[PDB]
């Protein structure tokens, strides 16, 4: 597995003011409606709004993004293992993830504290897409 190399970060800035679920720290967040698979969600965020990529959360943004959820629904996020360690997002950095099984598909939920791993990511879940505000 590798990152598909044509779905990179956004060097531009736009977020639609009408239909976004919540905002924090100068980012406009989007919960998708069509439950894609995990590998496809790199395309799904880049085809929803311009200057928008698939995202993985940082431990300060995390309690807000889980508080705007229901009790049952889940949500893919954007961390992976391109090598043999150091779970990183597309934005860069490191995280900490409750691991059980392996390959490169990670979700959150309501009672979750960090991102947590998943076993068969042929399943269909909504995805999380972000975009920076006008200050950048």
């Amino acid at each position, epitope marked *: 597995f590798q990152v598909p190399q044509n779905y990179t970060k956004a060097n531009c800035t736009y977020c639609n003011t009408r239909e*976004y*679920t*919540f*905002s*924090y*720290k*100068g980012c406009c967040f989007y919960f998708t409606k069509k439950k894609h698979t995990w590998n496809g969600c790199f395309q799904a965020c880049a085809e929803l709004y311009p200057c928008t990529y698939f995202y993985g959360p*940082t*431990p*300060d943004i*995390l*309690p*807000v993004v889980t508080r705007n959820l229901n009790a049952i629904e889940s949500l893919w996020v954007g961390v992976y293992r391109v090598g043999e360690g150091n779970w990183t997002s597309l934005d860069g950095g490191t995280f900490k993830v409750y691991q059980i099984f392996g390959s490169h598909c990670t979700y959150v939920s309501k009672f979750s*504290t960090v991102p947590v791993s998943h076993h068969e990511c042929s399943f269909l879940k909504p995805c999380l897409c972000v975009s*920076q*505000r006008s*200050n*950048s």
Partner: antibody
Amino acid sequence: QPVEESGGRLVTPGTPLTLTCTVSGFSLSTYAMSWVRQAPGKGLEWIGTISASDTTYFANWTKGRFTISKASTTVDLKITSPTTEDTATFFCARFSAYESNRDYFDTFDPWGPGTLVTVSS
Amino acid sequence: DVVMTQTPSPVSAAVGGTVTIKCQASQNIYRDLAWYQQNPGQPPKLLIYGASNLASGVPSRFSGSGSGTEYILTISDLECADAATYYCQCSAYGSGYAAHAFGGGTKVDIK
């Protein structure tokens, strides 16, 4: 008692100075603390911020002087070199995230009592 | 970064009335303000956040609003206790960095 500070002394400048603010009743790994200087007879000005993770930032007027350490149950402030201008009281804050509809703003909701820091030779 | 300007010092009115106080900014911060008060010898306490929304536990008589770079904080049904200073606070976030600011506001009654 959400947050309480400690460490006020009086000293001539140059000398190494540290304070801390202890927390209770939640986790400091999920929230983020900050610092703010209030000179006696003045307003406020924001010093710095230790995040949920270990990354941090400061205001531009601070020249690398104020630096912040995160501990197991407290947050440690480390001052390199005070001057006579640095004499103030310091307040340890907490970034709480309340909400309007579809928005989430960022406020210093709980404020500690603070401790007077002083310079008189 | 962002710099703020507020009203000058001497603000008062009659006991039990309505007093306004305005905080103007430099650049656009997208309805992100906060208002704090401190009794002399006391820490700040949150009053109105999000530039238009009441906090939890503050009485309903307060009202602040506005848009753009200039905003208002208005009182209704003044109390002899509510006589101390009042601050305004913004927060602008960059792409990677983050910053904050404050201002200098003064007491609101003796008459």
